Amino acid sequence: DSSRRQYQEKYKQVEQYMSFHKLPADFRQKIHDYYEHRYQGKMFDEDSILGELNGPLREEIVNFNCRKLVASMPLFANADPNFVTAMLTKLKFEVFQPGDYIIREGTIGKKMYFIQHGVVSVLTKGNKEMKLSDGSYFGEICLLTRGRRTASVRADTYCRLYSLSVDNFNEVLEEYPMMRRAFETVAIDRLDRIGKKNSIL
Amino acid sequence: DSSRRQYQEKYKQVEQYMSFHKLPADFRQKIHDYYEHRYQGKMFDEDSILGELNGPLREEIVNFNCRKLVASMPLFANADPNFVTAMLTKLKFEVFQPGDYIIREGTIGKKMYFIQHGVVSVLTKGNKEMKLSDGSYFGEICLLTRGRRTASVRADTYCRLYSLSVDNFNEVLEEYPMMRRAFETVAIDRLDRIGKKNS
Amino acid sequence: DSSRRQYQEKYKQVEQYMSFHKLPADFRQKIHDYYEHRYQGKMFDEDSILGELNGPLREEIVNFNCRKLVASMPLFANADPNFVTAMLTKLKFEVFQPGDYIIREGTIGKKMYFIQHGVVSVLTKGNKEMKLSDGSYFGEICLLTRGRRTASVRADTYCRLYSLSVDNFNEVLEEYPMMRRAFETVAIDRLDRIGKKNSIL
Amino acid sequence: DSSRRQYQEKYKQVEQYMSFHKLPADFRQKIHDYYEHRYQGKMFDEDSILGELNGPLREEIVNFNCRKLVASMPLFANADPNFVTAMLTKLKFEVFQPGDYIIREGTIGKKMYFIQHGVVSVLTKGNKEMKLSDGSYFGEICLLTRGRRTASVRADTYCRLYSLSVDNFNEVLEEYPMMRRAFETVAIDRLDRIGKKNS
Ligand SMILES: O=c1ccn([C@@H]2O[C@@H]3COP(=O)(O)O[C@H]3[C@H]2O)c(=O)[nH]1
Numbered sequence A, C: 001d002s003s004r005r006q007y008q009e010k011y012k013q014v015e016q017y018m019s020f021h022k023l024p025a026d027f028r029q030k031i032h033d034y035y036e037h038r039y040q041g042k043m044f045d046e047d048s049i050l051g052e053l054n055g056p057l058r059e060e061i062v063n064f065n066c067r068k069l070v071a072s073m074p075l076f077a078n079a080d081p082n083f084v085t086a087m088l089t090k091l092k093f094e095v096f097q098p099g100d101y102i103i104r105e106g107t108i109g110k111k112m113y114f115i116q117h118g119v120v121s122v123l124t125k126g127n128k129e130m131k132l133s134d135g136s137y138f139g140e141i142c143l144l145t146r147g148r149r150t151a152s153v154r155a156d157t158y159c160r161l162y163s164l165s166v167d168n169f170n171e172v173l174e175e176y177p178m179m180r181r182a183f184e185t186v187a188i189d190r191l192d193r194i195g196k197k198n199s200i201l
Numbered sequence B, D: 001d002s003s004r005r006q007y008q009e010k011y012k013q014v015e016q017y018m019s020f021h022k023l024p025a026d027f028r029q030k031i032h033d034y035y036e037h038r039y040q041g042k043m044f045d046e047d048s049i050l051g052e053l054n055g056p057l058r059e060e061i062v063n064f065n066c067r068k069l070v071a072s073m074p075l076f077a078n079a080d081p082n083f084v085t086a087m088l089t090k091l092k093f094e095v096f097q098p099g100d101y102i103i104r105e106g107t108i109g110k111k112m113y114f115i116q117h118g119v120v121s122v123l124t125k126g127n128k129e130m131k132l133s134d135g136s137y138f139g140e141i142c143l144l145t146r147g148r149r150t151a152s153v154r155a156d157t158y159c160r161l162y163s164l165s166v167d168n169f170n171e172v173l174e175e176y177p178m179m180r181r182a183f184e185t186v187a188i189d190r191l192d193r194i195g196k197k198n199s
């Protein structure tokens, strides 16, 4: 209803914005396709909806909303239910298109990504490409070690991801410190592959 | 008028959201019941409204609105009207449904709760249940001690509660440091019952 | 136009809010009278208007908007034009009604007030009442000394004031440090009256 | 469409505000001219729009939108495309009218400015004027040195400028510390001209 009307009205705005800034045709279609895949014809002010509720309802919703991600992520498959719930309530749903550089090597990293659906290539200067898909995560090394992105990460298909900010990452880890090790273990394997023998983890 | 219509429009938007996210029907009904009890057909941007006023008017409005809560609460009984006002200004209104766990034993606590109307059960592994009702509060132990929750608290009825965050709690206690003692006395008696001591 | 329509629509909301919370009749009329005196039938999103402009236009507007206050305040009558402009751009216009306690003794003070128009009584426990009016300011002692309100301040008439927050106060004073003395001088006179011989100033 | 109407509705609201505050007619016309040049009949919540997108799309859009600025600016000439993107992401678009003092000698500086289109005069007490135009920047000295503005800068034409705050400047320079040198070199040459040295 109004959710569809909000999609339509906001897409209208986007169109006007693009025409005003004279974006080329190919990019306008890309933006079109992004809205369609990201929102599917509906837009909600989720933060204001969830804000209207209480903690327990909010908990149940984030838990059900992220059921697919939870299922496919062994980090989550197995864990303490309060840890999961704390993680989930901080995640931000993001959609990426084929070709997008989600992460650029050498930049400073402020977030990590969990793959619900899609395929990404990890491109490290100095090494071969490798691929990550459903139930993998990436970007954890900068959150753990606060240095620079050790590789680029590029979407190969439409990717539905959930991002976590560094500050949120540390908020959750200060509460469930025993869970840090799980990230670190994955991080050490990846650092080993790219020739960083790394004690900090 | 527009506030009844704002409720109507908002609840349709919630229905649309639940359908999009494919939530199960009984959850959908749970959510419908929550809105009915929480908002009772009307919605307001209270932040926008209050923010259009001045301090004296907001103070007056908060005291008036919480006059029943305040009279029910022994904490406010002997108390400085400025401490009362400081507290009220910082409370967030919340409603819970029967069987909701407001608090879970073992988790980290960031808020405490005052009861305006309803009954809750305090569920402590290792001890008998106890009930709390109108004008008591709970959840204060982790705000004082920064430990884990010592008990679960479950809504037995519909509960209308006002929550106070740990940051606001400290702020107002920084301001009225004589009032910390009242909370400590209660906390101490409940720690005694569950066989705990804390220096 | 829409400014009047926004007043009317927002006053409607207020009315609904009050009926819902069952406020008594006398207080509803007080709120009515407040809207009428504060807004005069018009409402603007000033922050969004001023946000649309640039610095120089913004400067000219705050300067003209506060012409009356500037005129009647010797602190301002005389001062460096950049200091004034910096002060003005931080002030918040507030209206108070006869009987209002603007400030309560013993509380912690986070703002001071400049009187554009109106009369206030300063009520110190332990001393006689005194009055302040157009071109006076009050509440400066807590901003300077960060302790407790040394007296209550109650509106006797409709008062049109401009408030300044402590953080804004210090922001401006870190830039124009030579202006602090002016507040301190007034503060010392008032502290003397209420029996606080005070070196901190 | 709605963005043309948003301009119309917004400008009526500005007219209402100016009438309420009793601003003089020529100021009222000044403000009318500013809106015409700044917004050119359309208004958008760019924050809301961009915020609906993702990082890759916002990056693409910012680079596309600033392609002329970037090509005009020698600072970006040899530069890492990630440093360029970091900077662009932090710029705020601003327009000034002829005779506006963008900066006043002697005041405290919190921002610097890049010129996309227009000419400014640099007015230094004690020295001859100089002009700056498309692709130069100014106001960088106080961002580096945290002193007072060493000169006034006045708009001679309509000026379309992008501003960068001191906090954002440091943030991006924290990230690309090799780029600080470029700003220093310019700053040093301008300090030389006004007979100043700084260790
Ligand atoms: O051989 C490798 C090297 C790295 N990576 C990922 O790429 C990410 C880039 O950002 P980051 O450096 O914050 O985290 C990195 C890892 O998650 C990988 O999966 N396999």
Ligand SMILES: O=c1ccn([C@@H]2O[C@@H]3COP(=O)(O)O[C@H]3[C@H]2O)c(=O)[nH]1
Pocket (backbone or CB within 6 Å): B103, B109, B122, B124, B130, B137, B138, B139, B140, B141, B142, B143, B148, B149, B150, B151, B152, B153, B190, B191, B193, B194
């Ligand atoms: O015997 C008992 C034990 C506990 N309680 C309450 O349950 C609360 C759970 O969270 P918390 O640990 O921060 O605070 C606790 C108290 O407010 C109680 O009333 N009686």
Ligand SMILES: O=c1ccn([C@@H]2O[C@@H]3COP(=O)(O)O[C@H]3[C@H]2O)c(=O)[nH]1
Pocket (backbone or CB within 6 Å): C103, C109, C122, C124, C130, C132, C137, C138, C139, C140, C141, C142, C143, C148, C149, C150, C151, C152, C153, C190, C191, C193, C194
């Ligand atoms: O004899 C007196 C005593 C005090 N006062 C004012 O009352 C104010 C109360 O708040 P404050 O303590 O932050 O600042 C105080 C002064 O500005 C006054 O005008 N005359």
Ligand SMILES: O=c1ccn([C@@H]2O[C@@H]3COP(=O)(O)O[C@H]3[C@H]2O)c(=O)[nH]1
Pocket (backbone or CB within 6 Å): D103, D109, D122, D124, D130, D137, D138, D139, D140, D141, D142, D143, D148, D149, D150, D151, D152, D153, D190, D191, D193, D194
């Ligand atoms: O001879 C001169 C002197 C100065 N300037 C510029 O004017 C600016 C004024 O503010 P600021 O002091 O932060 O930075 C200064 C420079 O960018 C210049 O281009 N040539």
